[PDB]
């Protein structure tokens, strides 16, 4: 009876806006971002994507506690490159790759008879 209702593993709350930026203090040009109602699904994806970027100096994430559908993500870019920008570019690249995959698989799927 202390079980949290499972629908809040994907449902933004009240003021639980999907994101919550926080400027890091330990290092310059770095930021820490919190996602609500998320998990490795999105995290590890975006994280590796960032890692692809050349101007990103640091990128890692963590799910603090499995009872909770959050994960913090910490970016750190070189100077003259806002973190939120690196995030935007990572999302865009991911979306383009997904779109390509979608069409390509749809194609090769039509390649069948069943």
């Amino acid at each position: 009876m202390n079980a949290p209702d499972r629908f809040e593993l994907f449902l933004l709350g009240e003021g639980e806006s999907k994101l919550k930026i926080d400027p890091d203090t330990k290092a310059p040009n770095a930021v820490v971002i919190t996602f609500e109602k998320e998990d490795h699904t999105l995290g590890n994806l975006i994280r590796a994507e960032l890692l692809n970027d050349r101007k990103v100096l640091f990128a890692a994430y963590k799910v603090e506690h499995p009872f909770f559908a959050r994960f913090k993500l910490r970016i750190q870019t070189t100077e003259g490159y806002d973190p939120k920008d690196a995030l935007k570019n990572a999302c865009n690249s991911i979306i383009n790759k997904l779109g390509a995959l979608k069409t390509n698989f749809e194609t090769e799927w039509n390649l069948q008879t069943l």
Binding site: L9, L42, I94, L98, A100, F105
Partner: protein
């Protein structure tokens, strides 16, 4: 294409086997996991057992009802109940099923999924016919009736995803693999006498050349070229399963993007 290439090895009524190449491991795995977990569909969700005299407890039966795959191809025309303003359900957010059974026979009367009958108006949406993979034509065996036992109830089917409850999964366990030759050395083989003999080499080992032992371990290399196989429970055509998994993942990422827009907004 410029990103991933898909090469379908084989496609069936319920499975696609395909090579996923020129991708990153994380993207593959995320795709894997979303297909398992986050692609929405339709399932029984509330049962009004108006009468029951079987030997099964109601909640037992209602449980089995939950698990019955339903035709959910165009689920998108349906609305999450938490979004429909109607008092708990309507035809924009639900499908009403019903069930009556009676042990008219002297022998045992089986009760199959196919006995379910849609009541609510589908509005011409290819939704909710219980999936019948059975060759004999009657779907899941719901319950058995002896003689006088009568079972009569109505159900509500609703859009949901596997995160809330596994019954919504079109999942049907997904296979996954890469570097069958362990060239990446991502794993190390426990063995008593020889790793080579004691480990049955995977069937995918052929699609890549055996490592030439006279080569230094390449550290530059990274894992692409994943061999995946997706089995579909049947509530959705397999190709539709993978396509919608891709699309759902894309949607949620786009949502992140939009949230960034709101932040930079104010």
């Amino acid at each position: 294409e410029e990103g991933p290439q898909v090469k379908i090895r084989e496609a069936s009524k319920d499975n696609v086997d395909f090579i996923l190449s020129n991708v990153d491991l994380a993207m593959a795995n995320s795709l894997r996991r979303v297909m398992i977990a986050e692609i929405p569909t339709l399932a029984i969700d509330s049962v009004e057992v108006e009468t029951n005299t079987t030997v099964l407890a109601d909640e037992f039966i209602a449980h089995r009802l939950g698990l019955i795959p339903l035709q959910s191809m165009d689920i998108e025309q349906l609305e999450y109940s938490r979004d429909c303003f109607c008092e708990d359900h309507c035809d924009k957010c639900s499908v009403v099923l019903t069930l009556q059974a009676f042990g008219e026979s002297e022998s045992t009367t089986n009760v199959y999924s196919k006995d379910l009958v849609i009541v609510s108006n589908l509005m011409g949406r290819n939704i909710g016919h219980p999936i019948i993979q059975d060759k004999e034509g009657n779907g899941v065996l719901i319950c058995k009736l002896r003689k006088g036992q009568e079972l009569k109830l109505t159900c509500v089917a609703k859009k949901g995803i596997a995160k809330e409850h596994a019954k919504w999964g079109p999942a049907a366990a997904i296979e996954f693999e890469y570097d069958p030759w362990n060239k990446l050395k991502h794993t190390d083989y426990w063995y008593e006498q020889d790793s080579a003999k004691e480990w049955p080499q995977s069937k995918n080992c052929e699609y890549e050349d055996p490592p030439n032992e006279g080569d230094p371990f390449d550290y530059k290399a990274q894992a692409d070229t994943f061999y995946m196989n997706v089995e579909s429970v049947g509530s959705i055509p397999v190709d539709q399963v993978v396509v919608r998994g891709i699309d759902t993942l894309q949607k949620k990422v786009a949502s992140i993007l939009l949230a960034l827009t709101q932040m930079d907004q104010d």
